[PDB]
Design a protein around this ligand. Structure first.
Ligand SMILES: NC(=O)c1nccnc1NCc1ccccc1Cl
Ligand SMILES: NC(=O)c1nccnc1NCc1ccccc1Cl
Ligand code: PRO
Ligand code: PRO
Ligand SMILES: [Sr+2]
Ligand SMILES: [Sr+2]
Ligand SMILES: [Zn+2]
Ligand SMILES: [Zn+2]
Lengths: 498, 488
């Protein structure tokens, strides 16, 4: 079973959920974690849905080198400035020192865009739409946490280059909506589409959009994905240039975008839907949607009778495969049935299917929901339609409960004292914000200073999350920021973050 | 158009094929090459086949960290000794030096097996069958060539741990059989299944089974894949143990294998099937099997008739997509039909589908085979039937000629003199060999006066080693017929 309680101490609960579900194994290098097949299948499920959608947009998959030269990495000044201290450098091969240290990619902007310049000579070479699934390394100055914050992580990064800004801006929102579909339709997690502030925006871009998710156990929010508009800052440094047919003889710099989604998605799914019985898989991403377990195999049952009980389970397995239900039949005669119930509950299989000798003679079986523990006795001939209905209802309620949790935890506050008090209750707040960096740092410093949390809870100030595309309330004209010294530009979502 | 010719300068011909087919782009870090969509789509075709086959064997996909500690890397002494010079070491996080350098994986044995030991607590925990599709770094010191020998490459690496030795021995030959299917059933390249010698076997294992392919244009053979039996060399170092089911108090060490296939497959495909017209894709791994191109679009053609020809091309697109044939209609307005002819030829699309106004009105179209250049006028009715037949014809034609090239370039020699003659003729010779590492160093140094190195001990050699035959050196008796030759 599970020892820790998600409501009391969240860290060891998360640590026990990711291990006992066989998702995460630990490594002797801090910030690096093993993705076991149970977690990796979730990533493959996300990969299969996102690949199919970006190919509709004309995006193609490729793979670029992981090593970056010093000169390439420092073409964009403000970009390398933000990533320099967290870049891992290869300095030697074997015992021989490298003449020039090469870098491990924290992101592939400076690796790809030299090639973009070579590939783009005429206007016919645009647009370039490329994506790659790969690993990056970010030796960050933060507490590592599996899935959420790791030194090495798997992701997709898509880099598109266009002749006009209207083409680029269109794709930014197209991709961000795809990231929102990954969270809301696959992981059953609600997200808030928004724009990052000037402080938290991608270094080297004009603006960045993001989806923010909420983790109610810790009251903290987390970034689920970003779609940046790079404008021309990178094409001006890497010389991604073409001649426009309408503007004779003049150098045109391409408009570029980048967008990324990481294996953090798995950790958010764990933090939102996991309970005190272990992991909870949304049926959409569940590696196994239905696990079939033979029950009641006493020593008195004959060898022929036991084989007929196994055959009925395999028959349920074939029936569910013919209707595209991902089903595993745990026929292993080496483990107890209660060990199997516990094993697959920890892993989060949405439905457990129990077949016993009495039920098989009676033309029925038992279906047990993972999210609620509700046990239903279903007729043998209704197995294909009933289970698919339960699988759909599990996905709906997981998103319904997470949405109602989000609606009640994201509110509006206009003054600093109400923003402070609501923040200390475990909520994220939309406040009228002037949109300046020095004020955002002031909020980060004063929310941590005036904090009143539970005994033992560490000091953590609120930071910017996003400027929501559709905020909760309209900003009344002339309304000042929460600092009182500058006019407010927009409602900005704030709160403690991962 | 391609400037170089395969018969003259193979190096410059190869550099121009991979770039003009838009497979490879070059990078300012020596030995690292960009895999563009046309190349990566081949790797995906290899991946979806191979992944489907190992799932039937109970192998599951995962992903282990790229960084390995000094202590974990040096646990197996023979394994770390062979890889030590070619391991890249991270020593700096920005400008702050790590207290201890960490290494980029050249292979993931020392990364995964510490986790294998924690997972194997009893007999119930075996077998463990894990595979990952990832990048790996081996910092070579020889001149790099795209696909064939690169500083960083993509691969899959399977690691399996078994309770018995018969189990691991079964899987080693099962995986090698799948590698043979990848090269023969998909890439249409014949391979020679064999066994590495003591000098060439995987450091840290007991034996290595490999598939060796031959590049006829250069006369040098190349290793297509390997499946190693690690035995207990690693489980005795990383403490992967389990209680003896029969004897209480006695530990048993797991029997392990490892097996890998890299993106070198694409380069071997290029070097074998490519011609002076450019790349030649086998239809089974071809991203685009058929390209539809509208022809005869003159400036005087009526917009109605011009629109009718466009629709006719999309009608073939809908029909071919209905019979699971990968087809793209190149209806782009800013490129001439002749430009698209040479464009898809360079990339290796097996069949070109030409639709002109005269051929459309006569209910016909043209089919151009990439391998032979034959042009076939086909009626609109027998489209899905004949195009499917040509695609399978292209697949068997490419294999039959590469198998015929391998038959006439792999002969048997019996002494040092005649082995040198056939080797410098651009062929690989099977010779009676004593298996010693001493003679393997001598045969490479002598026949260079480059040089032929051990490739594999064929599972099925050409001639049966008659009893009494000694090695080509003369000192020791010959223990088996071995295939030698210059290799990449
Ligand atoms: N070190 C990290 O920030 C991290 N670690 C593990 C997983 N995701 C991480 N980042 C999240 C992220 C990064 C880039 C683009 C989009 C996103 Cl959502
Ligand atoms: N540096 C290289 O040797 C190399 N470079 C690119 C591609 N494959 C490479 N190795 C071949 C290889 C390696 C492991 C297992 C099987 C094989 Cl076939
Ligand atoms: O790292 C980032 O945030 C952007 C998005 C993917 C590519 N680079
Ligand atoms: O490098 C090799 O040859 C073995 C096989 C894959 C993993 N390691
Ligand atoms: Sr920084
Ligand atoms: Sr000019
Ligand atoms: Zn302010
Ligand atoms: Zn000898």
């Amino acid at each position: 079973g599970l020892e820790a309680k998600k409501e009391e101490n969240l860290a060891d609960w998360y640590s026990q959920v990711i291990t006992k579900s066989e998702m995460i194994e630990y490594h002797d290098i801090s910030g690096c974690y093993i993705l076991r097949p149970w977690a990796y299948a979730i990533w493959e499920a996300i990969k299969d849905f996102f690949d199919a959608e970006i190919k509709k947009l004309g995006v193609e998959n490729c793979y670029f080198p992981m090593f970056v030269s010093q000169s390439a990495l420092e073409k964009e000044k403000t970009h390398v400035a933000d990533f320099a201290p967290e870049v891992a450098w290869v300095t030697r091969s074997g015992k021989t020192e490298l003449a020039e240290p090469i870098a491990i990619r924290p992101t592939s902007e400076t690796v790809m865009y030299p090639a973009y310049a070579k590939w783009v000579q005429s206007h016919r070479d645009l647009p370039i739409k490329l994506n790659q699934w790969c690993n990056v390394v970010r030796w960050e100055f933060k507490h590592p946490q599996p899935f959420l914050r790791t030194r090495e992580f798997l992701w997709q990064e898509g880099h598109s280059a266009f002749a006009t800004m209207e083409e680029a801006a269109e794709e930014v929102l197209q991709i961000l909506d795809l990231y929102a579909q990954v969270y809301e339709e696959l992981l059953a997690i609600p997200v808030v589409k928004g724009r990052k502030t000037e402080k938290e925006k991608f270094a080297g871009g004009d603006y960045t959009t993001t989806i923010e998710a909420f983790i109610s156990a810790s009251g903290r929010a987390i970034q689920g994905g970003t779609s940046h508009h790079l404008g021309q800052n990178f094409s001006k440094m890497f010389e991604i240039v073409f001649e426009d047919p309408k503007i004779p003889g003049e150098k045109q710099f391409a408009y570029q975008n980048s967008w990324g989604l990481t294996t953090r998605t798995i950790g958010v799914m764990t933090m939102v839907h996991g309970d005190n019985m272990g992991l909870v898989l949304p049926p959409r991403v569940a590696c196994v949607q239905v696990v079939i377990i033979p029950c009641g195999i006493t020593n008195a049952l004959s060898e022929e009778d036991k084989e007929a009980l196994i055959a009925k389970c395999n028959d349920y397995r074939r029936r569910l495969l013919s209707v595209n239900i991902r089903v595993r039949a745990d026929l292993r005669d080496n483990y107890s049935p209660g060990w199997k119930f516990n094993h697959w509950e920890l892993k989060g299989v949405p439905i457990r299917l129990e077949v016993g000798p009495r039920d098989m003679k009676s033309c029925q079986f038992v279906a047990v929901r993972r999210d609620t523990g509700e046990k239903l006795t279903v007729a043998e001939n209704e197995a294909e339609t009933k289970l698919q209905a339960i699988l759909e209802d599990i996905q709906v309620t997981l998103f319904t409960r997470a949405s109602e949790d989000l609606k009640t935890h994201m509110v509006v506050a206009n003054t600093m004292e109400d923003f402070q008090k609501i923040l200390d209750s475990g909520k994220i707040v939309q406040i009228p914000f002037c949109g300046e960096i020095d004020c955002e740092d002031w909020i980060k410093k004063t929310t941590a200073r005036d904090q009143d949390l539970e005994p033992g809870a560490p000091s953590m100030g609120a930071k910017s999350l996003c400027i929501p595309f559709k905020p909760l309330c309209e900003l009344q004209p002339g309304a000042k920021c929460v600092c009182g010294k500058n006019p407010a530009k927009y409602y900005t979502l704030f709160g403690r973050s991962y």
